Symmetry: D2
Subunit: 467 residues, 4 copies
């Protein structure tokens, strides 16, 4: 059941209703690539939920109370105060780049253990219930290997498990033993987990994981773009916390990490901003080192930062993002879409709190993988309903940088994400209806072939035509 | 069918989800009078659609571009420019009071005809397809009698008619003849018409009405709080204008009036503001007289007026309110609610574009009229779903100012209005479900009796208890 | 000395710098009437300070947190809470019309005393240290005579007195005795007083006045558009309150009135809004009656009111308007301009906190009164520096409504008002320099004569030419 | 002469006026380091003008019209349209990091010439009339040597020259010849130039420089954080363009570069944002490569970017920043402060459009360099007037990373920068008065010594005490 909005809509962004003929011409002009479509020509944009959601009245208002001072800004103080009251963390570093300055804390933590415990850079390995792509990227760029210790139930769509994002506790222990505690720079706890489309991590699991890390004195970083949704799943599925507020669950949750890194463009409800925070004085040196590197990250002083209004807005968003009614509504809407698609026969390889990954291959079996069935489905969805989605298959995969040959892809998927507090149940039904129509006219959908192909990141600007 | 929102929600006002126990206590504290409830304790507030709807991004942004100059404000110029381009009217007077300064143009028009055609104040009569309550009030206060010349099909819920708000052309002609053209100060064309819950007026009807008025040289005022919805109904139901844009229909529509008066708090999408405009130089003296009276209305100079941002916002709202996709969506939502209620057996005495008037008497037959069955229904709807609606029955009617006895009331109705772009299909279904539940437990609902009753306007602050 | 701004400018409204030739053409097109000039063509607009000043960041932000509910709005609650904490008054009625609903409380108070003490409408007289024009207007319109009991020092520009706005305590007592206590519907305490361009009222004077009123049980209404500036003058000039905060002085000040009426467009820093408040339960019936009349003021129900954001903004403005640094700065700027003009030989008939009234007659002696020397000066000031000011002389006075002859005027004055936090010391020096230039080329300035003259309120739209 | 503001102040940020005793305690708590002071305790913050200035009404309003789409955003289109109309550049890349993605175009240009003309990375040298510190940093980090070819008059405070920021045309030619054209990856034209506190570059000089670069086919990048002020100086000092508008001068100016890089936090009037743009198709490959690197700059995909409102705001700011009246006013204010300081005997090593560098050594000769006389002056300025400025001397210089010994410093300077449209002439006079007081009590000011010193970037968080 789709819950009624626990809010009154106050400000809207008009979106024109286009004709089928118009969209047919539009998709052709864009070279059968939704990425090349004008935003105005997209009725329901499911490209991403990162920074594309709505804000509350108080959040928007906060943008006009900014203190733009270079240092000592009351807006920075307000944000740090929210972090202290919400997460219990004493040190806050606002971030305006990718994620939560992962490019910052990673090299800082590696060097810390190298100087204190003789960490060996050639043998170092970092662990996580599941590393986000960028987190894994910065780790590897820094010469650190990563391992995801997720549980057996994680990717098993056949079995139902309350916390599929949980750490494989024995796997983690085994990994540390195997690698050597001196060689483990940090452990990243991602909540909710990005495995299987987004799955929650239980507080019991986080506590157990933290005890293991503490035993070996390994820094624990909470990757928390979706800290609120994880708190909601705990309140909903972990009996012990059934009567706890989202705020209490969050305060308790963060006792089991030493610091946190997060993009504020998800649960925090803002279009820009991030955070890198440290719990207490035990990590004061890590805070100092990170703040310092933030300035000379380029190898010399460089200044930048969120405008005052943005810090005031995030200071409010951290609270509004934890609203119980809101969280129940947001999650119920995502589940409503997934359940609706399943009902009409649409199959997803994985579907969770973050996104649904429709199997375009099964939906359009007559199309060869090399002809990008998921990109064709994306185009068809646009033609039929003006929906824009992202292909996660051979098209995205690209070619071998050394052979120029198409890389092999396990499955041709079409990703559906939902911007927060942006679309309604009617839009969800509109999407479901669109897939029902596509499924019905599947055999008639054509494969694609390049008319223009960039050497790198081809999915963003490549142009194709029907076969 | 409820259409999908032709927009992306951008700003929301959080509303808490309350428990039944909480609402039970709340309604008691408010003395079984929703008017006394805190807005925060109301989940779906259907009290009124006047100034309670959402605004577009451009409209909200306009509030920050205000020119606060006492005279010659570029913001005033922008608003007048919108009126000139949209309605074709050369003279604009922004209003910030009730409706569109009806308290202004009425005395001005009466005096005009009195001086030019020897109008007799003791015999004067004003006509309209249907006078809004306030319009009728200012007319009568000024000593002018009013007559509503609506068509036979107007209040006949048994027959379907495309334009139930139409003028009874022969009735108007007959009335003028009867009263004497010199004694008819003005004719007010209300669009959409407030008869039968809101019904459209055809352009063919307006043209015919204007020819009659022109023949007798009688000023025609377009009461247009809902000018856009009327334009939409014309595009939808009047074949001649099927392919015309809302803008073209509006420009054409206003050729058939000499001036316009409107509250901008409906179709114009703003929380405050109104307009009093004159088409061309033929009414320049009426414009001058109105502007003058605006200043010395109290019998001496008094200054006030919309802030610059409000005029800039309205200048934009007049355009956004005419968006075709928006209008189709808004109207479809209203019809969706009505159709849904009819389906579950809920009966309305009248239902149209403005509101739905549920018959509380038929829904709760065991409750005596004197015990206010519509007020009881209002309370029950709040208890069950946190919905706030307004009683239009014996409670509102009140007592005889000369006898202190309850006045006789034709029907006990509960009014449902829908704030623009504020609630979703899910809320509409929530409302329908609430009525379904009430209908099922009807026999158990109790009547009400006063515990506190004001001498005047008792419906706003009276307190009652169950019998 | 002009104090430095106790604030950082955050948002500006661009104003173009025009050439002398451009302004010469502009003033001609406007018929030698600044009222007819476009705001954009005015560099320094000294027309009025009513709703033309700047707002603080928090005030502007508040506009986006509005609760538009018809009743029970949290925004209304926030405003009432500010009034309760600032003035100590328990009942609040937001106003959106002229001043503070003087058209409301006056008839309510007259009727109250008529029913309770047999007040005689044919003999009733209201008192005030000095009635504002509109206040006097509503009193007289209601058939009530008014008397200003100001002190001897009030209009004496030759003597310096700390509180020229003080009530003539013995005069008030004598007046009540003379008129009869049953016939005195109310006493209005205006702070700061509008006499002599704006003069403060001491707390000692207000206390003494209230004791007199209390003795005769006569309602006291505090007309407080400039309550903050009065509080500042008390802190500056009344020794007893030297170390009290503006907030403490204000709380104490309002113990000496039973209710308050104020336009929020002055000290409260907003472009729109007003207030009508009652101190405690002793005036609950007056509150109820006023709220009721607010609805049926037209003789029937009419709905209107400030939008939610406006109430939230005023809730903040009442506090920001009391900022000590701000008040000292605002007042010092006004005094800076006056002192500067005096230094160059410019003479004012009166000058105070509200405005400076330059004597155009003395500055331009060669121009006959009937040729409007103050209107000529206004035009010259615009030609020379792009300054717009308002004439308060024969031009404004107009003709005898019964003789059509020019009415006799005591002096030809040009009013200078200063919008709050809008202009700088540089603008003040620019204004002073402009007058210095005018004084130097005075003999060459020409008188004016009509080319177009309205029958009423001619000063607003009349057009003239040079003689 | 300080010009009057060509604008009306509309929104203000309150700043409290502190007592001397309060500031004395505050500066001690901050360890005699203004960087550690709360913004609220700073009356006049001259720390930096980067993103600390005011915005216009239209700019602020634009923040509410954002299109947050990941791709095809109408807000991105609006910004690109402004760039095309203002600079004539067809390709736009919005930046949200440091400056204008210098970390992006530098490696792209180096690789371009390496592949096309066999550039030798071990011999490459980049030229500029004067490289900004960050620009020089990214160049060197990329292994590229830099040379500043400024003119002899540049740093000569004894001689007056209209365009001290000019390229040393013969020096540039000689340098390219010396280095070898194949080894010169790019030439950066900084406008206005950061040499000698900010000095303009003439259009004649830019044209001559571009002809030289074009002759050798060397890419020219316009570093234009202050493009508007440079245009203003050209209109003021370069006779040929005396009657040209700032817009025309800017369009002409950019014909002499192939691309532009700029922080929008200066002349563009925004608190955040930057730009990296390419003129035409000749640089389409450079645009494509830069956009690509923008995504995989970390060595893998990372997503981030300005929120829609920020792009809409910058789209407006580029225009408002070119307002002629505004530019004349801004520059006149800076010159007013400098002239005022010179008048009272304060000496600056250099002073220009960007900042004034007061010689603390000469002002406080009794203080040893190692005791940081400029940091002492900064503290004294705060104690006396609540002014916060930045030390540019031994304190900032720091210690030798290899010896731990204090590094030798040429002069002990105190930098004064002025946030745009933030402070008034009164604040400028307040600053001048403060220096007059310091100069008078100079002998009594004490030197400083560390109580806490970080290993790196000590100037930001170090704490000291008086000697
Ligand atoms: Cl706020
Ligand atoms: Cl806008
Ligand atoms: Mg900043
Ligand atoms: Mg106004
Ligand atoms: Mg309202
Ligand atoms: Mg974004």
């Amino acid at each position: 059941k789709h819950l009624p909005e626990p809010f009154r809509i106050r400000v809207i962004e008009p979106v024109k209703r286009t004709t089928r003929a118009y969209r047919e011409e539009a998709i052709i002009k864009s070279g059968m690539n939704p990425f090349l479509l004008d935003s105005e020509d997209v009725f329901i944009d499911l490209l991403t939920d990162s920074g594309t959601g709505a804000v509350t009245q108080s959040m928007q208002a906060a943008m006009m109370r900014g203190d733009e001072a270079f240092s000592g800004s009351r807006s920075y103080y307000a944000l740090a105060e929210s972090v202290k009251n919400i997460f219990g963390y004493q040190y806050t570093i606002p971030t305006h780049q990718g994620r939560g300055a992962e490019q910052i804390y990673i090299p800082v933590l590696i060097k810390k253990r190298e100087q204190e415990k003789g960490l060996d850079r050639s043998k170092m390995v970092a662990f996580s219930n599941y590393f986000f792509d960028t987190t894994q990227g910065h780790s590897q760029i820094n010469g650190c290997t990563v391992r995801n210790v997720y549980i057996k139930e994680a990717f098993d769509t056949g079995v139902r498990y309350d916390f599929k994002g949980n750490f494989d506790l024995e796997g983690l222990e085994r990994g540390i033993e195997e690698v050597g505690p001196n060689n483990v720079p940090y452990i990243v706890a991602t909540i909710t987990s990005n495995s299987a489309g987004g799955q929650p991590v239980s507080l019991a699991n986080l506590k157990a994981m933290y005890s293991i890390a503490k035993k070996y004195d390994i820094p624990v970083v909470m990757d928390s773009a979706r800290f609120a949704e994880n708190a909601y799943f705990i309140k909903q599925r972990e009996a012990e916390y059934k009567d706890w507020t989202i705020e209490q669950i969050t305060r308790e949750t963060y006792k089991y990490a030493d610091m946190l890194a997060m993009s504020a463009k998800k649960d925090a409800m803002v279009p820009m901003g991030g955070l890198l925070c440290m719990k207490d004085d035990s990590f004061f040196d890590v805070y100092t080192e990170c703040r310092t590197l933030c300035v000379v990250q380029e190898g010399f002083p460089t200044y930048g930062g969120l405008e005052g209004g943005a810090m005031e807005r995030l200071a409010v968003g951290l609270y509004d993002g934890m609203n119980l009614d809101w969280l129940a509504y947001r999650i119920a809407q995502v589940q409503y879409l997934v359940d609706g698609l399943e009902e009409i026969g649409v199959v997803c390889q994985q579907a969770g709190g973050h996104a649904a990954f429709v199997d375009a291959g099964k939906l359009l079996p007559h199309i060869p993988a090399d002809q990008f069935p998921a990109q064709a489905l994306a185009c068809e969805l646009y033609k039929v309903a003006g929906i824009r989605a992202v292909e996660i298959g051979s098209f995205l995969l690209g070619r071998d940088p050394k052979t120029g040959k198409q890389l092999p892809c396990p499955a041709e998927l079409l990703r559906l994400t939902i911007p927060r507090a942006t679309y309604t149940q009617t839009h969800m039904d509109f999407i479901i209806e669109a897939f029902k129509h596509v499924k019905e006219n599947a055999a008639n959908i054509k494969g694609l072939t390049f008319t223009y192909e960039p050497k790198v990141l081809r999915h963003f600007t490549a142009k194709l035509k029907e076969v």
